[PDB]
Amino acid sequence: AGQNAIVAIACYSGYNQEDSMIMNQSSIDRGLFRSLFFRSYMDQEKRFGISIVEEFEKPTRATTLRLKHGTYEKLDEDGLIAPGVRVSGDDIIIGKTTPIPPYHTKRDASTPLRSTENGIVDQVLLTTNQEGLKFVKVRMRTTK
Amino acid sequence: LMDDDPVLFNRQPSLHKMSMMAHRVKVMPYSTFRLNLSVTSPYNADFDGDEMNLHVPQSEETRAELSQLCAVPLQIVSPQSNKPVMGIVQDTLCGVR
Amino acid sequence: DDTITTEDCWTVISAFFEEKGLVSQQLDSFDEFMETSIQDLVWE
Amino acid sequence: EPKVNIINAQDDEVELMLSDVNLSLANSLRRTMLAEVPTLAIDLVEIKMNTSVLADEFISHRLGLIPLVSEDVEEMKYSRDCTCEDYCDECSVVLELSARHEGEEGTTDVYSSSLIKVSGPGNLNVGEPVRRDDYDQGILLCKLRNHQELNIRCIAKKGIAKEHAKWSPCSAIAFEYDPHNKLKHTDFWFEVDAKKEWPDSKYATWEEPPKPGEVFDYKAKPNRFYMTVETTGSLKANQVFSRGIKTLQEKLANVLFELENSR
Amino acid sequence: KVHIGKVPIMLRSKFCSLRTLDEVDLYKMKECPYDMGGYFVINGSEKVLIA
Amino acid sequence: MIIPVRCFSCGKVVGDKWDAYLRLLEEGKQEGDALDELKLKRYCCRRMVLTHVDLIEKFLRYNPLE
Amino acid sequence: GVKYTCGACAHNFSLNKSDPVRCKECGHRVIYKARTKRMIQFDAR
Amino acid sequence: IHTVMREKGPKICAELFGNIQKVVNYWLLHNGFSIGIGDAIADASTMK
Amino acid sequence: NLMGKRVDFSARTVISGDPNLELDQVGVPISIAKTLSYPETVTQYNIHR
RNA sequence: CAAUAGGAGCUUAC
Ligand SMILES: [Mg+2]
Ligand SMILES: [Zn+2]
Ligand SMILES: [Zn+2]
Ligand SMILES: [Zn+2]
């Protein structure tokens, strides 16, 4: 969980004072202390009744309301983004709709990406939960 | 936010009036805040993880208040012990010796 | 017979860790629980 | 007045003594060879199918760090000064890598020799990944198991080491002068005696040690510089040295041009 | 045999299904051989009991 | 994970030497002598090869999911 | 429709949003989507 | 610092910090200053 | 909520040292400099800017 | 043109 860096102890330029520390940009460029980051988002469908359930689906503007301010143009027809796609902040990675109880009768419950993070989708998993409703896990990847 | 705007700059805990002082802005890349090294003593700060807060005055009265009462040059001498609180530190002292 | 050196001590310690590992207290507690504690709680 | 005395000269490294030049000149030459001599390196990677255990940007970083033959890179243009859209044939070199493991035992290693040059501004001798010998296997890139595949289209471009270390033609430029401290430019830390506790420079026998009767000289400047350039095979040592000199010359000519054409 | 409930299992214990299965089948079951166990899995989340 | 192409500190290419280093280690030669023959003379380059841990062997053991 | 893959038996297939989530060859319970078809660029830095 | 603050005002005293910092930092950059394991070692007679 | 409260127009990040800044200068990241703002009344001395 | 609450736990700098 570390790397053997070559360290000098010197008052070189004054940028390492009070527990600061100068690092070689070239060594960073060659891969020193470089790390991968994986974030996984989760979501599933709930059952609010008999025939009232949620659905993974790309929410069209006409039948849906209160759509997030991110872009939906990355979801496939199943409401899921595909692995291998570049994703920015505020982008939707799991589209989901919750029906409106008693056209234009649906609200969205989509999961956007965190407003700070960039990265690349790595592994979009799809299964069913304890109660047999559809279950999705999406692992993102990035490099820091 | 632009160069030379007065902003109130602050580290917790704010034990005395010189823990929160008004600084002039200089815009830079590389997402950390930059401080001249002689003001790290009144803040009791160092550069091993610390974070500090920045408050932007939203009117001219508060700009003038910051620049004429809270500015860093005005707090060099403290009333706590009628002596300076900012000095030469930590490599400039060794080098000047 | 000769004097036990530091390396002999590290050989002994390697034997200790080969047997027990680093989380043996958790595992042994839970094995004791499932072997005896549940039945004893049912028969309390 | 400047003089060069080569002490060792092979393809990858040259060891030479530089003399009758100012220290600023020698240090500027060292810096130029480390940072501003253009080379060729993969600057854009395109993944088609990567089912290996390694991640995409991991492999991209490794491919960018692969030395490529750059002998003719100076007759080439920077991709920011070409009228062309998405890479053309004259300001970029396109490489292909295709690898695949078939079978259910063993591991197939993917080496840099497997990179294949497809296009490039012929007949310029640029682009090929550098091999040490005829039988060299190159750099390790990835490893593959059953049914795992790697399909990559790399683009190579011209750049310098200021932007990123992968364009550096040099590894380490050893550099020293005045082995006997006649100029007193250093001041030796010691416990008992500074002469016993400090190892001799490898060029100590190249200069006369100071005599005990000698007094300090305040006219002497540094005049002889011993430096050992090493390369990564992308350029040859004489090529690195000569193009560092030429790059410095053209930087000074640029300054002169701006000065004269500022009147 | 009345079913009275489900007890969570400590991984790598005598009642875990990974206790057997020497390294090859551990690899086939997607389990890291360095993983030492000692924790529980509740709703897919690893939980450790602090003494 | 896998042997780095360059030395972090100076930039010498060490990515083509890991297999040779392992072959040198099989016939009994100790690490310093193997690093000497591969002509790694600076201790930065030497610690590049001497401290590498090859984890790709462990990562490759989990069956490809495609 | 869109290509999926088993997690246990590595079978490739494609489901069309109305059959349940299952593998043909084995019948396993967990599936992963397939990699996209678009082309992805990296900076090699 | 106290003298310059009292005689010249806060602005000149503030600029004094910068002047001294810059001069001394340049000199130390081209002089150098380090510390090593040998700086904590006393000779044999002092150890006795 | 009365003796102390959360306020708009504030920022926070790690601090670093800079020997080349003046005593009353603070270096502000570009992203924060663009996220935070100051309202400047338009007048006949600053309209071009 | 609209992004819940309450708790517990682990941490950061003094
Ligand atoms: Mg601190
Ligand atoms: Zn072009
Ligand atoms: Zn090295
Ligand atoms: Zn299957």
CATH assignment at residue F37: 1.10.10.60
How many folded domains does chain G comprise? 1
Contact residues, A window 17-56, toward F, CB-based 8 Å cutoff: 24, 26-27, 30-32
| CA pair distance C7, D153, nearest whole angstrom | 54
In a mutational test of the D interface, the residue from F6, F42, F66 whose CB has the highest number of chain D CBs within 10 Å is F6
Asked whether B75 and B15 are in contact (CB, 8 A), the reply is no
Provide, as residue numbers in chain D, all residues whose Cβ is less than 8 Å from the Cβ of G41: 44-46
G44 vs D: CB within 8 A: yes
| Element at D188 (helix H, strand E) | none
Q: Whose atoms come closest to the Cα of D88: which ligand?
A: 2
Cis status of the peptide bond prior to A59, with omega within 30 of 0:
no
First to last CA, chain F: 22
A12 vs I: CB within 8 A: no
DSSP codes of every residue in B16-82: SGGGEEEEEEEEESSSSEEE-GGGHHHHT--SSS-EEEEE---SHHHHHHIIIIIBGGGGSB-SSSS
Residues D152 and D56 in one domain: yes
CB contact (8 A) between residue B47 and residue A14: no
- Touch between G and H (at least 3 CB pairs under 8 Å): no
| Element at G35 (helix H, strand E) | none
| CA pair distance D204, D190, nearest whole angstrom | 20
Give the closest residue to C24 by CA, choosing from E14, E42, E45, E17: E14
* Smallest Cα distance from D150 to chain A, Å: 14
- Does any strand J atom come closer than 7 Å to the Cβ of A115? yes
For D215, the domain range is: 1-38+166-263
Give the closest residue to D38 by CA, choosing from D212, D201, D215, D156: D156
H38 vs D: CB within 8 A: yes
D70 vs F: CB within 8 A: no
Q: Stated in angstroms, how far is E47 CA from J10 C1'?
A: 13
How many folded domains does chain F comprise? 1
DSSP codes of every residue in D195-212: TTSSPPPTTGGGSPPPPT
- Does any strand J atom come closer than 7 Å to the Cβ of B61? no
Residues D95 and D33 in one domain: no
Other residues' Cβ atoms within 10 Å of the Cβ of residue I9 = 16
Q: At what angle do helices D23-35 and D237-260 cross, to 10 degrees?
A: 110
Size of interface C-E (CB pairs under 8 A): 30
CA nearest to D66 within chain G: G44
**Torsions phi, psi for F62 (to 5 deg):** -90, 125
Provide, as residue numbers in chain I, all residues whose Cβ is less than 8 Å from the Cβ of B25: 25-26, 28, 33
- Does any strand J atom come closer than 7 Å to the Cβ of A116? no
Give the closest residue to D142 by CA, choosing from D168, D114, D104, D166: D114
The domain that holds D250 is classified in CATH as: 3.30.1360.10
Residues D48 and D156 in one domain: yes
Annotated binding residue at D88? Answer: yes
DSSP codes of every residue in I1-49: --SS---SSEEEEEEEE-TTS-TTEEEEEHHHHHHS-------TTSS--
Provide, as residue numbers in chain B, all residues whose Cβ is less than 8 Å from the Cβ of H31: 95
The domain that holds D72 is classified in CATH as: 2.170.120.12
Question: Which bases of strand J have any atom within 7 Å of the beta carbon of a protein residue?
Answer: 2-3, 12-14
| Chain B residues contacting H via beta carbons under 8 Å | 36-38, 71-74, 76-77, 83-84, 86-88, 91-92, 94-96
Q: Whose atoms come closest to the Cα of F49: which ligand?
A: 3
- Domain boundary pick from D102, D133, D165: D165
Cis status of the peptide bond prior to D123, with omega within 30 of 0:
yes
How many folded domains does chain D comprise? 2
CB contact (8 A) between residue A124 and residue G40: no
Other residues' Cβ atoms within 10 Å of the Cβ of residue D31 = 13
Give the closest residue to A39 by CA, choosing from A97, A89, A95, A76: A89
CB contact (8 A) between residue G12 and residue F66: yes
- D13-19 β-sheet, strand order: D3-9, D13-19, D224-231, D170-177
The B 6-25 residues near strand J by Cβ under 7 Å are: 12-13
The structure was resolved experimentally with cryo-EM
For F19, the domain range is: 1-66
First to last CA, chain I: 39
CB contact (8 A) between residue B38 and residue H17: yes
B12: the nucleotide nearest its CA (via C1') is: J14
Tell me how far apart the 2 most distant CA atoms of chain I are, in Å.
Answer: 42
In a mutational test of the G interface, the residue from D40, D42, D45 whose CB has the highest number of chain G CBs within 10 Å is D45
Residues D3 and D96 in one domain: no
- Domain boundary pick from D99, D134, D165: D165
The domain that holds G1 is classified in CATH as: 2.20.28.30
CB contact (8 A) between residue A24 and residue F51: no
- Domain boundary pick from D148, D165, D182: D165
**Which residue(s) pair with B25 in the sheet?**
I26
Provide, as residue numbers in chain E, all residues whose Cβ is less than 8 Å from the Cβ of C25: 51
Asked whether B96 and B51 are in contact (CB, 8 A), the reply is no
* Structure's resolution in angstroms: 4.6
- Does any strand J atom come closer than 7 Å to the Cβ of B29? no
Residues D175 and D241 in one domain: yes
For G22, the domain range is: 1-45
